[PDB]
Write a protein that binds this ligand. Structure first.
Ligand SMILES: OC[C@H]1O[C@@](CO)(O[C@H]2O[C@H](CO)[C@@H](O)[C@H](O)[C@H]2O)[C@@H](O)[C@@H]1O
Ligand SMILES: OC[C@H]1O[C@@](CO)(O[C@H]2O[C@H](CO)[C@@H](O)[C@H](O)[C@H]2O)[C@@H](O)[C@@H]1O
Ligand SMILES: [Ca+2]
Ligand SMILES: [Ca+2]
Length: 533
């Protein structure tokens, strides 16, 4: 019986929608929309941003598309033939999320007694086997085969206690301060994640060029969520009706110029801007033109799966200040999210803050299929056979005021199907010494679990340069390295690592047998692919 009331009235008219042709229920829903302009949880990844990101992906623009790799050159990591944490025996592990021991202000890969040090998740494919390992090479060395493994940081283990991604920097005494995610799986196989820290001490034998783990001290939980800014495990236990992501992970250490230390990490928003049926009616979340936003509003309302995901999406990239106890830190201060995606996504991962000149750049990896807009992400699988991207923001301040790069946030987009050898994920930008406008993008290549075939293991990708423009835009550069190079310099470039999207080229991006092979059931993988321009 009733009618449109408040600001929504103006909105419907602007749109050119015939008010009389609105059913009774429509008007009741429309009257639920809330037009508050006050942002509750930092800069947002909006429904519109998401859609644009997906569109940019489908377009395969050379500005943002992950360069093609020469598939025939990709090999499993030799240092991955190593003692496994959950069996104590030498096995063929694969290696994924990885991070260099790096300086906390500058991000530069650290030089430890002439070695570069990287810490990474490794384990046996198709086994629940998530643990972190220390890897090392001479500093500046580019040979993938020269990396060696110093073993699991915490020794032999089980799936009850796992270690997922974080970061690492050096202490003054040359120990490593490690930030990692401790995960406890005892409560009904849930991944109960906590941000943790430990001091790792190394034994070096100069004459054998061999590093070992000597002591691991001060292992403790640093942060579990506050409940207001960030969701806690308890809050998740209550609400989670099965269809909910839990996140307290991927801590990236950064220092300001005054020597304060912060961890930037992946989480979910707490009660400050919580998930729920209400998030659908927050006009703020749409971020398009009013007309656009109204189309979106209806899409969500009529598609029950989208509506469902929308209720549950509240990914956030959080930040906390640590106290001054370097080796045994506690939380000094909890801030509001740098970025959040209420209604839009339940997963933004591996955040990374690099300070370039005077601005703070924040990047994160995402899988668009964790997004709420099925029509958006199903279309990317149809185009490219993958839905991964790296998003990015810039700010004058570490702790607030982030602004999306390239309009929507997109910085990098998936360019080959997820079950190809050359599929990539877990982008991690590393700064380049004496090039303050470029970043080295590292990642891992080949998805876990042998999706690309037996013996095809997740391994370190060739790295490639990304160009940062002061006008808040980015361009992918056609400059590529050997597999597993964390340190760009002039000797680093290896153009033979570059691929082409052609079936029979010797530097094809597809291995023999991949071009046109199925992904996600029927989708002929490679059909909708096009050259980068
Ligand atoms: O139980 C979580 C744990 O299982 C593993 C190995 O069994 O997952 C593998 O199998 C999944 C499908 O059943 C894949 O989606 C997954 O990517 C693959 O690794 C572990 O990898 C995972 O940590
Ligand atoms: O292996 C855990 C590690 O990988 C990331 C992504 O690089 O998360 C992966 O594992 C989670 C559960 O196994 C998934 O929820 C997520 O989608 C998957 O990509 C990191 O965030 C995490 O530290
Ligand atoms: Ca959620
Ligand atoms: Ca190098």
């Amino acid at each position: 019986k009733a009618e449109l009331k408040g600001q929504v009235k103006d909105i419907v008219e602007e749109s050119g929608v015939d008010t009389s042709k609105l059913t009774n229920d429509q008007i009741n829903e429309l009257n639920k929309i809330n037009f508050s302009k006050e942002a509750k949880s930092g800069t947002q990844l909006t429904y519109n941003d998401f859609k644009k990101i997906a569109k940019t992906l489908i377009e395969q623009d050379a500005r943002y598309a992950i360069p093609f790799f020469n598939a025939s050159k990709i090999k499993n990591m030799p240092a991955a033939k190593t003692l496994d944490a959950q069996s104590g025996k030498v096995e063929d592990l694969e290696i994924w999320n990885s991070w260099p021991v790096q300086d906390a202000k500058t991000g530069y890969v650290s030089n430890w007694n002439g070695y570069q040090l990287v810490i990474g998740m490794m384990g046996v494919p198709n086994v629940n086997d998530n643990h972190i390992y220390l890897l090392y090479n001479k500093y500046g060395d580019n040979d993938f085969n020269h990396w060696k493994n110093a073993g699991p940081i915490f020794g032999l283990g089980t799936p009850v206690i796992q270690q997922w991604s974080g970061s690492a920097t050096l202490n003054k005494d040359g120990s490593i301060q490690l930030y990692y995610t401790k995960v406890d799986t005892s409560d009904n196989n849930t991944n109960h994640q906590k941000l943790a820290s430990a001091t790792v001490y190394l034994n070096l034998e100069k004459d054998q060029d061999k590093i070992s783990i000597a002591h691991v001290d001060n292992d403790h939980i640093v942060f579990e969520g506050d409940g207001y800014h960030y969701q806690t495990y308890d809050q998740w236990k209550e609400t989670n009706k099965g269809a909910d992501n839990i996140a307290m992970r991927d801590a990236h250490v950064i220092d300001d110029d005054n020597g304060n230390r912060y961890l930037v990490f992946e989480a979910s928003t707490g009660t400050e801007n919580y998930q729920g049926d209400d998030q659908i009616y927050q006009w703020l979340n749409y971020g398009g033109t009013n007309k656009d936003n109204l189309g979106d509003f209806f899409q969500i309302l009529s598609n029950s799966d989208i509506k469902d995901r929308a209720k549950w999406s509240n990914a956030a990239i959080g930040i906390i200040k640590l106290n001054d106890d370097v080796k045994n830190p506690s939380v000094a201060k909890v801030y509001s999210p740098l970025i959040s995606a209420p209604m839009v996504s339940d997963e933004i991962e591996r955040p990374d803050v690099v300070k370039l000149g005077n601005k703070y750049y924040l990047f994160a990896a995402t899988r668009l299929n964790r997004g709420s807009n099925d029509d958006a992400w199903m279309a990317t699988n149809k185009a490219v056979g993958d839905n991964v991207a790296m998003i990015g923001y810039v700010s004058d301040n570490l702790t607030h005021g982030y602004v999306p790069l390239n309009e929507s946030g997109v910085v990098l987009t998936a360019s080959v199907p997820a079950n190809w050898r050359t599929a990539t994920y877990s982008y991690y930008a590393v700064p380049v010494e004496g090039r303050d406008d470029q970043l080295l993008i590292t990642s891992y290549i080949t998805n876990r679990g042998e999706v690309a075939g037996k013996g095809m293991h997740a391994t370190w990708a060739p790295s490639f340069l990304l160009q940062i423009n002061p006008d808040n835009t980015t361009t992918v550069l056609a400059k590529m390295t050997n597999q597993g190079d964390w340190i760009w310099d002039d000797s680093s470039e290896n153009p033979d690592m570059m691929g082409v999207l052609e079936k029979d080229a010797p530097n094809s991006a597809a291995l023999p047998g991949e071009w046109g092979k199925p992904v996600d059931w029927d989708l002929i993988g490679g059909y909708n692919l096009k050259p980068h321009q």
